[PDB]
Amino acid sequence: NPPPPETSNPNKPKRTQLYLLRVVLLWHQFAWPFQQPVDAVKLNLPDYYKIIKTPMDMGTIKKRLENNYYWNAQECIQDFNTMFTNCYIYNKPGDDIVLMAEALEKLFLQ
């Protein structure tokens, strides 16, 4: 598996609306697949990280909000976007994992 995405970066500009923790974070019965980086070794998906070059997960997104990683909600929102999109790209419409994402994504467009 690659190193997980960074959640700490002292020389990054940080701050707010970052509401994205307190209401927007899903963390729900279909959350468990997304609470950590895809383990492509444990799932025996040797192609996952060959297809998915911007991996992202709510575990990373949680540690980021709590570490004051972000500058704006646009940044965090794009990460949520990336998480959902990744899942749709790697998979096929109407897969169990694709259903779980869509559920969360609907709660997320709320």
Ligand SMILES: COC[C@H](C)Nc1ccc(NS(=O)(=O)N(C)C)c(Nc2ccc3nn[nH]c3c2)n1
């Ligand atoms: C719906 O159940 C099917 C799913 C493919 N199984 C499964 C089992 C474990 C995880 N989580 S993990 O990679 O963190 N774990 C093995 C430690 C999981 N998550 C998962 C998360 C996103 C995915 N996108 N495509 N496939 C994905 C699978 N999915």
